[PDB]
Design a protein around this ligand. Structure first.
Ligand SMILES: *[C@@H]1O[C@H](CO)[C@@H](O[C@@H]2O[C@H](CO)[C@@H](O[C@@H]3O[C@H](CO)[C@@H](O)[C@H](O)[C@@H]3O)[C@H](O)[C@H]2NC(C)=O)[C@H](O)[C@H]1NC(C)=O
Ligand SMILES: *[C@@H]1O[C@H](CO)[C@@H](O[C@@H]2O[C@H](CO)[C@@H](O)[C@H](O)[C@H]2NC(C)=O)[C@H](O)[C@H]1NC(C)=O
Ligand code: NAG
Ligand code: NAG
Ligand code: CA
Ligand code: ZN
Length: 670
């Protein structure tokens, strides 16, 4: 009668040192430690008999790459055969901008990441696989419920004037320029106890800005963190049976920095078409979060989403029932004929980035003085583009108009193709719920159009009252998708619409077709599409301890006494964190002494948002590992200690484990 449901969560955190953070594309934003862990969260549904399985995976990562998906799918086949295929598995990225880079195959993202990290890549894959394996081996008879509600005051539109380019009658049908609606998917067993939840909600996880060097899952990660910690009472962060995943949506033009765009020098509003300031230009125009710092902003936004997610979960009553289905297709997005009429058609283009891509956003500005809204090129940069990369054909220029091409990645294939041509489109249906796997970042109106169009298709073919959600950053990254009208303004998202002005119209057409195949039960009649390619292709340092010391020894102990609210800091002689990159669940623990049992009990780990782990490189193999415990006001007085877990490299090449334990210290009542 009802579904078999499995859920799982697994650590998919790469290395937290000697690597850049992915998302902002900032030059010097390298990882120097960890604020919280990154998890892969998998949800597996099956028919009563165990047939027709579907897998949705929400991953604490900036983007899901083509290479990541292909690697994961191959290993899934090896272990599970025909159970989990390209069509019934969705891999979605939460879009955190504080995750380790270097997991792409296409040249553009390899340049941004400054290379490819096998270590980081493999642990991501095993992390994703582990989450799936847990869900697979822990399936139970149960039911699925769904609920909807608005989340207030956690978002603004970071390109509102481009939104206004959309037709009036269309804009008149909505109350806001952002999708305030959260959709919670509730999962329980037949005994009524909690299994897990999924929460779709449109927002950029960029509350931690590009000045940050600590690995974390940002606002949506913190929301997942609060949900899991509330349900899994008595469990440490990252542990506990209940699994709570926030899923990315149409977040393309949605910012969490609700104070809005202001000029750093004057404090004036720079909410204009160019996102620029009269004195200092675009680099002065920045949107800030609600908190005292980025940590506070992240938690304020994250808590609000958690609060609404908690309420909707509790009050969920509408049951989800019906058959499971899935449809997938590979599509050459460079050559899609899109119909604007019955009589009139146009075409998608070979991938290209516009001038305004280099301008960044109010959530993270570019360094090169580019401004958003550039509909014209200049002889200066056109020259540089021609001399270095090559001169764009007249076809690709005309196809992309009015976008002025900065990078014509579609015609740049050395050493490997810079941008993908083959893109995944897929829909997975759980009864009346349809999930569209979007290969990038849909803007607000883009997601609205595709949702309703796909819903309408289902309706036309007998599947009534379908709830359709946009699942962002799925399967392969193709940057942003704007509406035709938004594309004209050529702001950052529009300049990052790589297949041209008709990219959205193509997807709506493609996804409508997928929905039709599912409803008419003719998904087998869908053409496979062209298969995507699998491309094949820091000096080693021996860690050292100070003379007369060894790894894990305390160089700086904590204060003898602390009051709640303060920050306890302990410094150890350390080794490179990348040596620890698979039984290394944490770099640190905060432990409380219990006098009655005369024993130490772990209260925090490196996944706790209250703790921070910094790594600083020294001379000739020397290095420090700093653990900070930001003592919460709710923390109980007592005797505490901080421990450190790492790995050192000796040399043939051997990795050894070590531990450090700080002298006991105390939190006091005042
Ligand atoms: C990302 O968010 C952090 C907040 O967590 C921002 O840090 C802030 O940086 C600004 C400027 O760098 C600091 O403002 C002022 O800096 C002057 C330097 O002359 C200083 O003397 C003043 O005390 C004043 O505060 C601000 O203090 C600092 N805040 C914190 C908590 O460190 C950072 O600027 C943000 N980055 C981006 C790119 O938005
Ligand atoms: C590791 O920590 C120690 C102490 O916390 C740092 O030592 C300071 O080192 C500088 C020069 O390196 C000295 O001038 C200071 O007097 C030291 N302070 C103390 C309190 O001893 C050391 O520099 C750190 N090393 C790294 C690579 O971060
Ligand atoms: C990458 O790592 C995997 C497992 O960690 C290993 O099997 C593979 O050979 C590595 N590839 C390279 C090029 O080092
Ligand atoms: C088809 O598009 C053309 C181009 O603007 C337009 O002139 C024509 O009215 C459209 N057809 C219909 C039926 O609206
Ligand atoms: Ca932590
Ligand atoms: Zn984004």
């Amino acid at each position: 009668s009802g579904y078999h449901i499995g859920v799982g969560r697994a650590d998919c955190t790469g290395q937290v040192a000697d690597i850049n953070l992915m998302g902002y594309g900032k030059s010097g934003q390298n990882a120097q430690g960890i604020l919280t862990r990154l998890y892969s969260r998998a949800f597996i549904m099956a028919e009563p008999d165990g047939s027709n399985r579907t897998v949705f995976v929400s991953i604490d990562i900036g983007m899901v790459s083509q290479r990541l998906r292909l690697e994961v799918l191959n290993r899934l086949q090896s272990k599970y055969g025909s159970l989990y295929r390209r069509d019934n598995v969705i891999l979605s990225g939460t879009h955190t901008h504080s995750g380790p880079a270097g997991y792409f195959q296409y040249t553009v993202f390899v340049i941004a990441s400054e290379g490819f990290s096998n270590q980081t890549f493999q642990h991501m894959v095993t992390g994703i696989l582990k989450s799936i394996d847990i869900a697979h081996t822990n399936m139970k008879p149960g039911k699925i419920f769904i609920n909807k509600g608005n989340v207030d005051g956690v978002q603004i539109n970071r390109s509102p004037y481009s939104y206004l380019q959309n037709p009036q009658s269309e804009r008149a049908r909505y109350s806001s320029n952002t999708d305030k609606e959260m959709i919670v998917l509730k999962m329980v067993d037949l005994n009524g106890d909690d299994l897990g939840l999924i929460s779709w909600f449109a927002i950029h996880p960029v509350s931690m800005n590009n000045s940050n060097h600590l690995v974390n899952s940002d606002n949506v990660g913190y929301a997942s963190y609060l949900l899991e910690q509330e349900k899994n009472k008595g469990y440490l962060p990252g542990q506990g049976p209940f699994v709570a995943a926030f899923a990315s949506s149409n977040l393309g033009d949605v910012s969490p920095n609700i104070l809005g765009p202001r000029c750093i020098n004057t404090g004036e509003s720079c909410d204009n078409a160019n996102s620029t300031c009269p004195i200092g230009g675009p680099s002065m125009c920045i949107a800030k979060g609600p908190g005292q710092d980025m940590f506070d902003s992240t938690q304020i936004i994250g808590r609000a989403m958690y609060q609404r997610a908690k309420e909707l979960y509790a009050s969920a009553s509408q049951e989800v029932t019906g058959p499971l289905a899935s449809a997938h297709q590979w599509v050459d997005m460079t050559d899609v004929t899109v119909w604007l009429n019955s009589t009139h058609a146009s075409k998608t283009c070979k991938p290209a980035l516009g001038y305004s891509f280099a301008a960044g956003t109010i959530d993270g500005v570019g360094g090169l003085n580019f401004t958003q809204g550039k509909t014209e090129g200049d002889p200066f940069w056109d020259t540089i583009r021609d001399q270095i990369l090559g001169k764009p054909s007249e076809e690709i220029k005309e196809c992309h108009k009015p976008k002025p091409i900065l990078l014509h990645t579609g015609e740049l294939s050395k050493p490997h193709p810079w941008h993908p041509d083959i893109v995944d489109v897929q829909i997975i249906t759980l009864g009346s719920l349809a999930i569209t796997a979007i290969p990038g970042e849909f803007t607000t109106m883009s997601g609205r159009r595709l949702r309703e169009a796909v819903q309408a298709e289902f309706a036309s073919h007998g599947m009534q009252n379908m709830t359709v959600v946009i699942s962002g950053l799925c399967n392969v990254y193709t940057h942003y998708i704007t509406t035709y009208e938004e594309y004209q303004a050529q702001r950052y998202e529009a300049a990052s619409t790589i297949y041209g002005p008709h990219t959205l119209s193509a997807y709506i057409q493609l996804f409508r077709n997928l929905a039709k195949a599912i409803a008419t039960d003719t998904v087998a009649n869908l053409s496979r599409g062209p298969e995507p390619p699998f491309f094949k292709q820091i000096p080693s340092i021996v860690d050292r301890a100070p003379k007369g010391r060894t790894f894990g020894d305390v160089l700086q102990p904590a204060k003898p006494e602390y009051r709640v609210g303060e920050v306890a800091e302990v410094i150890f002689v350390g080794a490179n964190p990348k040596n620890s990159v698979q039984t290394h669940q944490t770099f640190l623990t905060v432990e409380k002494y219990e006098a009655t049992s005369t024993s130490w009990q772990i209260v925090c780990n490196d996944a706790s948002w209250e703790t921070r782990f910094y790594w600083h490189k020294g001379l000739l193999g020397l290095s420090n590992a700093t653990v900070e415990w930001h003592i919460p006001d709710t923390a109980q007085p007592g005797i505490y200690r901080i421990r450190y877990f790492g790995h050192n490299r000796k040399q043939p090449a051997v990795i050894l484990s070590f531990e450090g334990t700080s002298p006991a210290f105390e939190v006091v009542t005042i």
